[PDB]
Design a protein around this ligand. Sequence first.
Ligand code: FU9
Length: 327
Amino acid sequence: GPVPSRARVYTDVNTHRPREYWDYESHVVEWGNQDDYQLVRKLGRGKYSEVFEAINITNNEKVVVKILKPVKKKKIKREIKILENLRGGPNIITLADIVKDPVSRTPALVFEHVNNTDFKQLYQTLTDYDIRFYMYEILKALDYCHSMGIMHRDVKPHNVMIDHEHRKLRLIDWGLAEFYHPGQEYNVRVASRYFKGPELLVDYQMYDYSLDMWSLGCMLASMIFRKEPFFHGHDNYDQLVRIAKVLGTEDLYDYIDKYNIELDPRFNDILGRHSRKRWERFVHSENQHLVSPEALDFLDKLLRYDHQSRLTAREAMEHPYFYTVVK
Ligand SMILES: O=C(O)c1ccc2c(c1)nc(Nc1cccc(C(F)(F)F)c1)c1nc(NC3CC3)ncc12
Protein backbone atom coordinates (compact mmCIF):
# COMPACT_ATOMS: atom_id res chain seq x y z
CA GLY A 1 0.00 0.00 0.00
CA PRO A 2 0.94 3.69 0.19
CA VAL A 3 3.99 4.85 2.12
CA PRO A 4 3.13 6.76 5.30
CA SER A 5 3.94 10.46 5.82
CA ARG A 6 4.36 12.78 8.83
CA ALA A 7 4.41 16.56 9.17
CA ARG A 8 8.00 17.80 9.39
CA VAL A 9 7.01 20.37 12.02
CA TYR A 10 4.51 20.57 14.87
CA THR A 11 4.19 16.83 14.45
CA ASP A 12 3.16 16.00 18.00
CA VAL A 13 1.51 19.22 19.17
CA ASN A 14 -1.82 17.48 19.81
CA THR A 15 -0.14 14.32 21.09
CA HIS A 16 0.95 16.34 24.13
CA ARG A 17 -2.04 18.67 24.56
CA PRO A 18 -4.72 17.74 27.09
CA ARG A 19 -7.37 15.50 25.51
CA GLU A 20 -9.98 18.27 25.91
CA TYR A 21 -7.94 20.35 23.46
CA TRP A 22 -8.42 18.14 20.39
CA ASP A 23 -11.28 15.80 21.41
CA TYR A 24 -13.90 18.14 19.96
CA GLU A 25 -16.63 15.49 20.01
CA SER A 26 -16.86 15.89 23.79
CA HIS A 27 -16.83 19.69 23.68
CA VAL A 28 -19.67 21.29 25.63
CA VAL A 29 -20.86 24.45 23.90
CA GLU A 30 -21.31 27.58 26.03
CA TRP A 31 -24.37 29.40 24.67
CA GLY A 32 -24.83 33.15 24.59
CA ASN A 33 -28.06 35.13 24.38
CA GLN A 34 -29.67 34.94 20.95
CA ASP A 35 -31.50 38.21 21.67
CA ASP A 36 -28.17 40.10 21.76
CA TYR A 37 -27.96 40.04 17.96
CA GLN A 38 -30.26 41.63 15.41
CA LEU A 39 -29.86 40.51 11.79
CA VAL A 40 -29.41 43.43 9.36
CA ARG A 41 -28.87 41.83 5.94
CA LYS A 42 -27.97 38.56 4.27
CA LEU A 43 -24.40 38.67 2.96
CA GLY A 44 -24.46 35.26 1.32
CA ARG A 45 -25.06 31.55 1.42
CA GLY A 46 -22.66 28.61 1.36
CA LYS A 47 -23.19 24.87 1.13
CA TYR A 48 -22.94 24.78 4.92
CA SER A 49 -24.39 28.06 6.18
CA GLU A 50 -25.92 31.46 5.59
CA VAL A 51 -24.01 34.55 6.67
CA PHE A 52 -25.64 37.77 7.88
CA GLU A 53 -24.42 41.21 8.84
CA ALA A 54 -25.84 42.02 12.26
CA ILE A 55 -25.66 44.40 15.18
CA ASN A 56 -24.77 43.36 18.70
CA ILE A 57 -27.30 45.48 20.58
CA THR A 58 -25.34 45.24 23.85
CA ASN A 59 -22.58 47.45 22.37
CA ASN A 60 -24.17 48.61 19.11
CA GLU A 61 -21.19 47.03 17.32
CA LYS A 62 -21.46 45.50 13.87
CA VAL A 63 -20.90 41.74 13.77
CA VAL A 64 -21.41 38.81 11.42
CA VAL A 65 -23.65 35.82 12.07
CA LYS A 66 -23.09 32.43 10.48
CA ILE A 67 -26.23 30.31 10.81
CA LEU A 68 -25.11 26.75 10.22
CA LYS A 69 -27.18 24.64 7.85
CA PRO A 70 -28.16 21.28 9.37
CA VAL A 71 -25.58 20.01 6.89
CA LYS A 72 -23.51 17.56 8.94
CA LYS A 73 -23.13 16.91 12.66
CA LYS A 74 -19.99 16.77 14.82
CA LYS A 75 -18.50 19.02 12.16
CA ILE A 76 -20.22 21.76 14.17
CA LYS A 77 -18.29 21.02 17.35
CA ARG A 78 -15.07 20.69 15.35
CA GLU A 79 -15.37 24.19 13.93
CA ILE A 80 -16.40 25.61 17.31
CA LYS A 81 -13.53 23.97 19.22
CA ILE A 82 -10.99 25.06 16.62
CA LEU A 83 -12.26 28.66 16.73
CA GLU A 84 -12.02 28.62 20.52
CA ASN A 85 -8.54 27.07 20.53
CA LEU A 86 -7.24 29.66 18.07
CA ARG A 87 -9.05 32.71 19.45
CA GLY A 88 -6.81 35.72 19.96
CA GLY A 89 -4.11 34.29 17.68
CA PRO A 90 -2.51 36.58 15.07
CA ASN A 91 -4.92 37.33 12.21
CA ILE A 92 -7.39 34.59 13.19
CA ILE A 93 -11.04 35.64 12.94
CA THR A 94 -12.54 36.12 16.40
CA LEU A 95 -15.53 34.06 17.39
CA ALA A 96 -17.41 36.45 19.64
CA ASP A 97 -20.31 34.23 20.66
CA ILE A 98 -22.41 31.19 19.80
CA VAL A 99 -26.20 31.27 20.06
CA LYS A 100 -29.04 28.92 19.15
CA ASP A 101 -30.98 30.29 16.21
CA PRO A 102 -34.68 29.72 16.94
CA VAL A 103 -35.67 29.64 13.26
CA SER A 104 -32.99 27.35 11.83
CA ARG A 105 -32.87 25.24 15.00
CA THR A 106 -29.09 25.19 14.58
CA PRO A 107 -26.11 26.99 16.12
CA ALA A 108 -25.33 30.49 14.92
CA LEU A 109 -21.70 31.57 15.20
CA VAL A 110 -21.09 35.28 15.80
CA PHE A 111 -17.81 36.67 14.43
CA GLU A 112 -16.02 39.99 14.50
CA HIS A 113 -16.97 42.15 11.54
CA VAL A 114 -14.25 42.95 9.00
CA ASN A 115 -14.72 45.98 6.75
CA ASN A 116 -13.07 44.21 3.82
CA THR A 117 -12.70 44.81 0.09
CA ASP A 118 -13.77 41.70 -1.84
CA PHE A 119 -10.84 39.95 -3.47
CA LYS A 120 -12.54 40.37 -6.85
CA GLN A 121 -11.98 44.15 -6.53
CA LEU A 122 -8.90 44.18 -4.30
CA TYR A 123 -6.45 41.93 -6.16
CA GLN A 124 -6.25 44.15 -9.23
CA THR A 125 -5.29 47.15 -7.09
CA LEU A 126 -2.60 45.48 -4.94
CA THR A 127 0.93 46.76 -5.38
CA ASP A 128 4.11 44.69 -5.11
CA TYR A 129 4.46 45.97 -1.56
CA ASP A 130 0.86 45.13 -0.64
CA ILE A 131 1.27 41.53 -1.86
CA ARG A 132 4.36 40.90 0.25
CA PHE A 133 2.75 42.63 3.24
CA TYR A 134 -0.47 40.63 3.13
CA MET A 135 1.32 37.37 2.34
CA TYR A 136 3.36 37.87 5.50
CA GLU A 137 0.14 38.52 7.40
CA ILE A 138 -1.40 35.27 6.11
CA LEU A 139 1.76 33.43 7.12
CA LYS A 140 1.36 34.70 10.70
CA ALA A 141 -2.13 33.20 10.78
CA LEU A 142 -0.94 29.93 9.21
CA ASP A 143 2.11 29.46 11.42
CA TYR A 144 -0.15 30.13 14.39
CA CYS A 145 -2.80 27.52 13.56
CA HIS A 146 -0.17 24.96 12.50
CA SER A 147 1.77 25.58 15.74
CA MET A 148 -1.53 24.95 17.49
CA GLY A 149 -2.03 21.57 15.79
CA ILE A 150 -4.59 22.67 13.23
CA MET A 151 -4.74 22.73 9.45
CA HIS A 152 -7.12 25.14 7.76
CA ARG A 153 -7.67 23.08 4.55
CA ASP A 154 -9.60 25.81 2.70
CA VAL A 155 -7.11 28.60 2.15
CA LYS A 156 -8.34 30.70 -0.81
CA PRO A 157 -8.92 34.40 -1.59
CA HIS A 158 -12.50 34.38 -0.28
CA ASN A 159 -11.34 33.14 3.14
CA VAL A 160 -8.69 35.81 3.63
CA MET A 161 -10.56 38.97 4.58
CA ILE A 162 -8.65 42.21 4.16
CA ASP A 163 -9.48 45.65 5.47
CA HIS A 164 -7.31 47.59 3.04
CA GLU A 165 -7.91 50.87 4.91
CA HIS A 166 -6.32 49.77 8.19
CA ARG A 167 -4.11 47.15 6.54
CA LYS A 168 -5.76 44.44 8.64
CA LEU A 169 -6.19 40.78 7.69
CA ARG A 170 -8.29 37.89 9.04
CA LEU A 171 -8.30 34.21 8.05
CA ILE A 172 -11.92 33.02 8.18
CA ASP A 173 -14.18 29.97 7.67
CA TRP A 174 -12.62 27.24 9.79
CA GLY A 175 -15.46 24.92 8.81
CA LEU A 176 -13.11 22.56 6.98
CA ALA A 177 -10.27 22.87 9.51
CA GLU A 178 -8.99 19.73 11.28
CA PHE A 179 -6.62 18.68 14.05
CA TYR A 180 -3.34 17.15 12.86
CA HIS A 181 -2.59 13.75 14.38
CA PRO A 182 0.51 11.88 13.15
CA GLY A 183 -0.52 8.93 10.98
CA GLN A 184 -4.14 9.97 10.66
CA GLU A 185 -5.81 9.58 7.27
CA TYR A 186 -7.97 12.56 6.24
CA ASN A 187 -10.77 13.17 3.75
CA VAL A 188 -9.33 14.40 0.44
CA ARG A 189 -12.55 16.29 -0.38
CA VAL A 190 -11.45 19.59 1.14
CA ALA A 191 -10.37 22.96 -0.32
CA SER A 192 -11.73 24.69 -3.40
CA ARG A 193 -10.78 23.02 -6.69
CA TYR A 194 -8.18 25.62 -7.77
CA PHE A 195 -6.40 25.41 -4.42
CA LYS A 196 -6.40 21.63 -3.86
CA GLY A 197 -2.91 20.25 -3.25
CA PRO A 198 -1.54 17.46 -5.45
CA GLU A 199 -1.96 15.19 -2.40
CA LEU A 200 -5.73 15.61 -2.60
CA LEU A 201 -5.75 15.26 -6.38
CA VAL A 202 -3.90 11.94 -6.23
CA ASP A 203 -6.08 10.71 -3.37
CA TYR A 204 -3.32 10.59 -0.71
CA GLN A 205 -4.97 10.81 2.71
CA MET A 206 -2.06 11.08 5.17
CA TYR A 207 -1.44 14.78 4.52
CA ASP A 208 -0.73 17.65 6.93
CA TYR A 209 -0.29 21.41 7.44
CA SER A 210 1.70 21.50 4.20
CA LEU A 211 -1.61 21.35 2.25
CA ASP A 212 -2.24 24.98 3.30
CA MET A 213 1.13 25.95 1.86
CA TRP A 214 0.22 24.65 -1.59
CA SER A 215 -3.02 26.66 -1.39
CA LEU A 216 -1.06 29.75 -0.38
CA GLY A 217 1.28 29.23 -3.32
CA CYS A 218 -1.74 29.13 -5.63
CA MET A 219 -2.90 32.46 -4.16
CA LEU A 220 0.58 33.95 -4.57
CA ALA A 221 0.82 32.85 -8.20
CA SER A 222 -2.59 34.41 -8.95
CA MET A 223 -1.55 37.71 -7.35
CA ILE A 224 1.99 38.20 -8.72
CA PHE A 225 0.99 36.98 -12.21
CA ARG A 226 -2.46 38.59 -12.24
CA LYS A 227 -4.26 35.39 -13.20
CA GLU A 228 -7.01 34.35 -10.78
CA PRO A 229 -7.20 31.53 -10.31
CA PHE A 230 -3.76 30.43 -11.53
CA PHE A 231 -4.46 26.71 -12.04
CA HIS A 232 -7.90 26.93 -13.62
CA GLY A 233 -9.10 23.33 -13.91
CA HIS A 234 -12.53 22.36 -15.24
CA ASP A 235 -12.80 19.46 -12.78
CA ASN A 236 -10.51 17.68 -10.28
CA TYR A 237 -8.82 15.61 -12.99
CA ASP A 238 -8.16 18.54 -15.28
CA GLN A 239 -6.95 20.39 -12.18
CA LEU A 240 -4.04 17.94 -11.89
CA VAL A 241 -3.35 18.21 -15.63
CA ARG A 242 -3.18 22.01 -15.34
CA ILE A 243 -0.66 21.65 -12.53
CA ALA A 244 1.36 19.03 -14.44
CA LYS A 245 1.62 21.38 -17.45
CA VAL A 246 3.65 23.74 -15.23
CA LEU A 247 5.48 21.53 -12.74
CA GLY A 248 5.86 18.77 -15.30
CA THR A 249 4.87 15.13 -15.40
CA GLU A 250 8.22 13.55 -14.47
CA ASP A 251 8.17 15.15 -11.03
CA LEU A 252 4.53 14.13 -10.61
CA TYR A 253 5.62 10.55 -11.23
CA ASP A 254 8.53 10.98 -8.78
CA TYR A 255 5.97 12.17 -6.19
CA ILE A 256 3.49 9.33 -6.53
CA ASP A 257 6.39 6.87 -6.80
CA LYS A 258 7.91 8.14 -3.55
CA TYR A 259 4.66 7.40 -1.70
CA ASN A 260 3.94 4.25 -3.70
CA ILE A 261 0.68 5.86 -4.89
CA GLU A 262 -1.03 4.89 -8.13
CA LEU A 263 -2.63 7.54 -10.35
CA ASP A 264 -6.29 7.04 -11.28
CA PRO A 265 -6.09 5.19 -14.62
CA ARG A 266 -8.40 7.81 -16.12
CA PHE A 267 -5.29 10.02 -16.34
CA ASN A 268 -3.89 7.64 -18.98
CA ASP A 269 -5.75 9.43 -21.79
CA ILE A 270 -5.54 13.01 -20.49
CA LEU A 271 -2.23 13.62 -18.68
CA GLY A 272 0.30 13.59 -21.54
CA ARG A 273 4.01 14.34 -21.14
CA HIS A 274 5.08 17.79 -19.99
CA SER A 275 8.38 19.39 -19.12
CA ARG A 276 8.73 21.44 -15.95
CA LYS A 277 8.42 25.12 -16.87
CA ARG A 278 10.46 28.09 -15.66
CA TRP A 279 8.35 30.67 -13.84
CA GLU A 280 9.57 33.51 -16.04
CA ARG A 281 7.27 32.42 -18.86
CA PHE A 282 4.27 33.71 -16.86
CA VAL A 283 5.79 37.18 -16.57
CA HIS A 284 4.60 39.86 -18.99
CA SER A 285 4.44 43.65 -19.29
CA GLU A 286 1.22 43.85 -17.25
CA ASN A 287 2.42 41.91 -14.20
CA GLN A 288 6.22 42.42 -14.18
CA HIS A 289 6.00 45.16 -11.53
CA LEU A 290 4.70 42.45 -9.14
CA VAL A 291 7.48 39.99 -9.96
CA SER A 292 11.01 39.82 -8.63
CA PRO A 293 13.59 37.06 -8.41
CA GLU A 294 12.65 36.81 -4.71
CA ALA A 295 8.94 36.31 -5.53
CA LEU A 296 9.69 33.60 -8.11
CA ASP A 297 11.99 31.71 -5.76
CA PHE A 298 9.45 31.93 -2.93
CA LEU A 299 6.60 30.74 -5.16
CA ASP A 300 8.82 27.96 -6.51
CA LYS A 301 9.41 26.77 -2.94
CA LEU A 302 5.69 26.69 -2.07
CA LEU A 303 4.47 24.93 -5.22
CA ARG A 304 6.10 21.49 -4.86
CA TYR A 305 4.26 18.24 -5.66
CA ASP A 306 5.86 16.63 -2.59
CA HIS A 307 4.05 18.09 0.43
CA GLN A 308 7.11 17.22 2.54
CA SER A 309 9.29 19.45 0.32
CA ARG A 310 7.22 22.63 0.66
CA LEU A 311 8.34 25.56 2.81
CA THR A 312 6.69 25.55 6.22
CA ALA A 313 4.92 28.72 7.30
CA ARG A 314 7.78 29.61 9.64
CA GLU A 315 10.43 29.00 6.95
CA ALA A 316 8.34 31.00 4.52
CA MET A 317 8.47 33.95 6.92
CA GLU A 318 12.28 33.78 6.76
CA HIS A 319 12.31 34.16 2.95
CA PRO A 320 14.13 37.09 1.26
CA TYR A 321 10.81 38.02 -0.43
CA PHE A 322 9.77 39.54 2.90
CA TYR A 323 12.94 41.54 3.59
CA THR A 324 11.31 44.65 2.09
CA VAL A 325 8.22 44.35 4.34
CA VAL A 326 8.33 46.64 7.38
CA LYS A 327 8.34 44.75 10.68
O1 FU9 B 1 -17.15 31.51 8.18
C1 FU9 B 1 -16.59 32.34 8.93
O2 FU9 B 1 -15.68 32.05 9.75
C2 FU9 B 1 -16.78 33.83 8.64
C3 FU9 B 1 -16.22 34.78 9.49
C4 FU9 B 1 -16.37 36.13 9.21
C5 FU9 B 1 -17.03 36.54 8.05
C6 FU9 B 1 -17.57 35.59 7.18
C7 FU9 B 1 -17.41 34.24 7.48
N1 FU9 B 1 -18.20 35.98 6.04
C8 FU9 B 1 -18.41 37.28 5.74
N2 FU9 B 1 -18.90 37.75 4.59
C9 FU9 B 1 -19.48 37.09 3.58
C10 FU9 B 1 -19.89 37.85 2.49
C11 FU9 B 1 -20.45 37.24 1.37
C12 FU9 B 1 -20.73 35.89 1.40
C13 FU9 B 1 -20.40 35.13 2.52
C14 FU9 B 1 -20.72 33.63 2.53
F1 FU9 B 1 -20.03 32.99 3.46
F2 FU9 B 1 -20.45 33.11 1.35
F3 FU9 B 1 -22.01 33.48 2.79
C15 FU9 B 1 -19.79 35.73 3.62
C16 FU9 B 1 -17.86 38.24 6.58
N3 FU9 B 1 -17.99 39.53 6.25
C17 FU9 B 1 -17.50 40.48 7.06
N4 FU9 B 1 -17.68 41.75 6.69
C18 FU9 B 1 -18.41 42.01 5.44
C19 FU9 B 1 -18.34 43.45 4.97
C20 FU9 B 1 -19.64 42.90 5.58
N5 FU9 B 1 -16.85 40.17 8.20
C21 FU9 B 1 -16.69 38.90 8.56
C22 FU9 B 1 -17.18 37.89 7.73
